[PDB]
Write a protein that binds this ligand. Structure first.
Ligand code: HAM
Ligand code: HAM
Ligand code: CL
Lengths: 416, 413
């Protein structure tokens, strides 16, 4: 007798489902406008695929189980690995650069509320085979367009930007093997989420000294690009890469949308370079979206030659919270072009004839299926939001006509 | 280093993915043309939901596990019923709901029955008469016709479980054993007569009642139905209406009566149907039927008539590929913006925005590459136009356009 859905999952009845479609049309449209090709993988993947274990939180937050037949498995918590699989699968036949997108469902055994439910759809845009920041620029501009398309602006939403190289330098400059670095990126991401002493505690636990911990704290708090230059020199990849990224987005004309934020690092250990996170200016919700460059990952899965990648994920939850707070998700109710009312059931076969004729003429149309009275029919027309009620009565039908109410006798040739 | 997908699942790279979109787009268009509303549930559901156990094959063919315990859906209908009942008193009827959910059966992989599949579900809820089924069956047809098929390629076989339900009820077996008989009897297509008859004797039934069933299944036409059960009978007059109404709608040649059709799912109550290719090459294209009692079974305080069908994304494709109706249509994009050298990049971007604003689909060379390479890229991604942004021209407020001379920035669109 049980009606509620599993755990923190969402049901999508028509009313809700429309909102989703509205949201998706946009992603697709934006992809197309930006020239991305759609792909998809199976939601269920091999457990083996997600073996990185870089101190992350995603490894245990897994819907994993065993089929017996074939080997053990898990429902995907992110698309990227599944992309990498498909890419590498394509092998020598893979033509580059490639620009691929997808709107896959994703499963994290996570903490339900607020806007981080146990299942979520995630719009992935990825550029593969592009070395320069030209990629990230495009990608970030793609998120913006989408949002702008949804009815947002730079004043509602921002995108914070940074490069992990800045950090990667600082660490490499003190005496710790890149060994412990990715874990530091996991730790350091928590600075937004929790207080400084507990981050600094976990970094001391990873073995690091206090004086190196200090350096990290400082870097994270660095105010601008100009200021980056002074801790690492204007002659430096990270520096000139950001300046290009920023000059290019300003050129494309989304200047107000982005800004530098030294704090941004991301919680996934395969990012190599530039990284970004979409946020609402008021600072109400978790990240709208997040992404960055991941050059080495494809080598990690075993590409005989390393393949640069950048790309982001864009959730379907937080974004909606924001649109609903900005009253940009007005329910647009179901409509249909025509409702065909058989006068009595003897007219039904003629009604059908008429219905076919409209559906052929490319109309969207509906027909009263059970025997019901004339009022009820009109009532139905109103419920389903019909633009027009075509009543098929006999007196008229014999004269080769039907009745039409808009929401007088019309012959068929003048109907459609 | 592992590239292949899990078990009998399909990867969908862009090339394949397009074929899917082409299919789904028809599914959606047809729905809309027929006035269905789209819905979706989570692919993962409670194990509890699929507890019927009417001698079926679907109960063990399950991707079940524990997190309460759960399983990945093998059919949408239960999940629909859940949502419907969930809506409660707020549910407005009749309702016409559709969806294209993925589904997971721990089944037998080849040929056209892979371990995962998408399934287009159309369901009418709250309609007593065959008017529903008619609509539903016409909906499948439209889709197919939309895909480029015809009555000569594909048929839809039709029948009513009441015909059988009578015959059994008329011999002395409780409805108790009936649904199991429908499971057994469905296998007649798939396997030989003696093994069906064996399993029915195993369900307890006599030989003389087994005979009656064999006979009913083989009944040639509706006229003939009349003679074993009277013209005055629900099943008989229901079919005659169904058939007269489809003929009216103008899909006469698409359907036909076949006494053998019963379906392998135990919740069907009345009319049932199955889509097939006339040549008899592949498993059922699609299948459905009326299921009035199911909603009471999940606990509706008043029974709610339903009909609806599922329409797989696998078999159908096998057929379209055999009829050469799935020509690969390769990716294309309106424009490719080539910065002459990297110094023009920021202007190139300016131009790219201007096109994307004008509603064009456009692309831009992202890495530094030579002029030829650019044009080569243009060809690869199938561009209709190459907008080279060179400096001599840019200063005069223009760009170079090659179609696959010099043009002013306001006249690219
Ligand atoms: N529990 C959740 N509930 C609702 N929304 C959620 C949830 N988790 C993630 N998201 C959406 O995905 C974005 C973060 O994805 P990610 O970067 O953590 O995972 C990725 O896939 C990264 N690999 C990004 C990426 C894609 N391609 C390259 N990098 C968030 O902004 C959020 O909107
Ligand atoms: N392994 C497979 N490979 C390819 N195609 C497959 C596979 N399994 C199922 N299908 C598709 O769905 C139909 C069979 O499922 P069904 O109709 O028996 O169960 C149902 O889904 C019921 N819920 C039908 C229904 C819905 N509403 C009322 N009745 C086939 O006609 C085919 O189109
Ligand atoms: Cl879709």
């Amino acid at each position: 007798v049980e009606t509620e859905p599993v755990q923190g999952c969402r049901d999508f009845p028509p009313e809700a489902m429309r909102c989703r479609r509205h949201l998706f049309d946009v992603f697709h449209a934006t992809a197309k406008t930006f020239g991305f090709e759609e792909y998809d993988a199976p939601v269920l993947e091999s457990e083996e695929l997600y073996i990185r274990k870089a101190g992350e939180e995603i490894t245990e937050q897994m819907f994993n189980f065993i089929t017996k037949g074939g080997h053990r498995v898990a429902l995907r918590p992110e698309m990227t690995p599944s992309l990498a699989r498909l890419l590498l699968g394509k092998g020598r036949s893979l033509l580059l650069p490639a620009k691929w997108y997808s709107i896959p469902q994703c499963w994290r055994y996570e903490a339900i509320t607020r806007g981080r439910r146990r299942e979520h759809y995630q719009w992935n845009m990825d550029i593969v085979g592009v070395k320069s920041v030209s990629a990230e620029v495009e990608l970030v501009c793609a998120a913006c367009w989408a949002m702008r398309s949804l009815g947002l602006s730079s004043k509602d939403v921002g995108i914070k930007v940074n490069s992990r190289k800045v950090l990667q330098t600082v660490v490499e400059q003190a005496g710790v093997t890149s060994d412990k670095f990715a874990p530091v990126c996991v730790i350091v991401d928590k600075m937004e989420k929790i207080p400084r002493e507990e981050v600094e505690a976990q970094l001391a636990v990873l073995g690091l000294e206090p004086t190196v911990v200090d350096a990290i704290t400082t870097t994270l708090s660095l105010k601008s690009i100009d200021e980056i230059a002074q801790r690492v020199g204007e002659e430096h990849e990270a520096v000139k890469e950001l300046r290009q990224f920023f000059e290019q987005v300003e050129a494309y004309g989304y200047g107000d949308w982005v800004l530098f934020d030294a704090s941004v690092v991301r919680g996934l250990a395969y990012y190599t370079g530039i990284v970004f996170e979409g946020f609402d200016r008021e600072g109400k919700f978790r990240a709208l979206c997040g992404g960055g460059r991941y050059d080495n990952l494809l080598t990690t899965y075993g590409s005989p030659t390393p393949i640069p990648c950048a790309g982001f994920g864009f959730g379907d939850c937080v974004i909606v919270e924001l649109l609903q707070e900005k009253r940009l998700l007005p329910d647009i109710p179901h409509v249909v072009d025509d409702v065909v009312i058989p006068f009595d059931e003897s007219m039904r076969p003629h009604a059908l004839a008429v219905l076919r004729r409209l559906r052929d003429a490319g109309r969207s149309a509906d027909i009263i299926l059970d025997k019901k009275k004339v009022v009820q029919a009109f009532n139905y027309a109103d419920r389903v939001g019909a633009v027009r009620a075509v009543l098929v009565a006999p007196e008229e039908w014999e004269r080769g006509e039907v009745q039409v109410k808009m929401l007088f006798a019309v012959p068929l040739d003048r109907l459609v």
